[PDB]
Amino acid sequence: NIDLPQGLVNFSTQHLQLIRFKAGLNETVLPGVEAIGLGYNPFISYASVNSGAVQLFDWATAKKREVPFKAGYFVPELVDVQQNDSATFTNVSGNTLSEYQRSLATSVAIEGRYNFFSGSLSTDFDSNSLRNAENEFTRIQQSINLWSLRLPSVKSLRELMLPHMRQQLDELNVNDPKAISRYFDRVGSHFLTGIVMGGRAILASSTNKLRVKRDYSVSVVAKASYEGLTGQLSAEAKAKYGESISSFTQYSNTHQEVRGGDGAKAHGVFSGKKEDFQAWVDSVSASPDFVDFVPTIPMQEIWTLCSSEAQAEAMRKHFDDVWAPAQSEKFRVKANFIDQLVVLTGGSSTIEPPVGYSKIEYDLNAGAGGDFIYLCYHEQTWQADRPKDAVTDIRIIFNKEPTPPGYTKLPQDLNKGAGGDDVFLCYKTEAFNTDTAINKVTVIGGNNADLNAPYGYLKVPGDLNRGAGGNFIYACTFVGK
Ligand SMILES: [Mg+2]
């Protein structure tokens, strides 16, 4: 029997009817033509029209041809239309946030080493989850495809442009870096060329990779959980994946999104009785929306519509050197790290350290008598200024060994008054480095000297009950990497 993650559906509608009205498109023009040729900022969202969006092309007056599979509807002759009446998955995952960002950015064919769909991070996932180095990330999208539209990058495209949009591009003052930035901000660095109309259901999840069942990959487990929530798991998938799904829900935070179809049936797609999902699916036909990309040609660079080589190269250069790095930097998010440790001592387990500090919940005199003692950490957020120093190493010293150079030494005795050796935690900090900064510290205890380290952690040598009895006790560290 299976625990499924609970949430509220976020239903999105795009503004397509209003975009069509603005373009003056006839109702015989296939749904989706209004989105082809839209100026696009590829940083903001995954396969969403930004409310900004300006059409470059005059599809109202362009020559049309009938859609063969949909009698009575028309598409510009230049636009290829492919029927695709199917349900497919567009799944992205990463073992780390940066790996998830790469995997998102490269889920479609867009050139440049940037955080391309990372504006989605602020709604797909939550702040604390994004910055927890214990977490991996999945985005499961089931697309309810009806058709796709493709605009091939043909030499005749400038001619199809709205005259005012063509003039605006041609008169861009490309000696002025601020004008080029503004043009990218207000019309786009790209334009849409390969879009899928229909519906989508999305489950975006942050999962504790150090605690979830590892029989299967998080992508597989996340997809099985999605299928659970929508009533689409077979009896065999339930038997095989049920335990994994339960673990997933115990160790994940999930976000539910629906687009396309009837908004009144959207809440309910994740109920999951199959009939509830299916009633939403069956509504997609009557209200398609832009939901996914044609992966091979999602969009073209806007300077391909420049008349001249000189203007195109000034715009490409500005993109790579100024505008895109500025955009991509708004989504550079690194995990919280530890920058300071204190020790707390007291007469019970409910003692609390001072305000910035959280207890590792293991009495460092466990089984040995004496005070309740807790190692406590301060979590620091990463900021591209400076940032600050990360704890990179912990070293336990005993009795009268000298503080190693230059470690800080916490002067409280991790054996007080349980007897035994005098035990002292030391640590060093260095300039923040992703390869080095300790994200998490824990403490383990056991009845034998050589304990199992928590998955992903390293044990710090030095028993924190050394010379007393009780348990063997070690600090352990985790570097997300
Ligand atoms: Mg102790």
Numbering used by the authors: 2 to 482
Anything the authors wrote about it?
We first solved the X-ray structure of Mpf2Ba1-1167 at 2.1 Å resolution. The MACPF domain has a central four-stranded antiparallel β-sheet with a characteristic ~90° bend. In Mpf2Ba1, each of the three β-sheets of the β-prism, arranged around a local three-fold axis, contains a unique repeated motif: Asp-Leu-Asn (DLN). Structurally, the metal chelation seems to tuck the three β-prism loops into gaps between the adjacent β-sheets, increasing domain stability. In the monomer, the N-terminus lies adjacent to one side of the MACPF domain, forming a short β-strand–β-sheet interaction with the central β-sheet, and two more H-bonds: between Asp292, stabilized by the conserved Pro291, and the N-terminal backbone, and between one of the nitrogen atoms of N-terminal His18 imidazole ring and the oxygen atom of Ser54, highly conserved among bacterial MACPFs. Since we observed that some of these residues are involved in intermolecular contacts with the neighboring subunit, we think that the steric hindrance imposed by the N-terminus could prevent premature interactions/oligomerization of soluble monomers. The X-ray density for this loop is clear, albeit weaker and with higher B-factors than the surrounding residues, indicating greater flexibility.
Mpf2Ba1 is a 53.2 kDa protein isolated from Pseudomonas monteilii through a multi-step purification process informed by artificial diet bioactivity screening against WCR larvae. The protein is comprised of two domains—an N-terminal MACPF domain and a C-terminal β-prism domain. Pore-forming proteins (PFPs) are a major class of soluble proteins that oligomerize into rings and undergo large irreversible conformational changes to become transmembrane assemblies and breach the membrane of target cells.
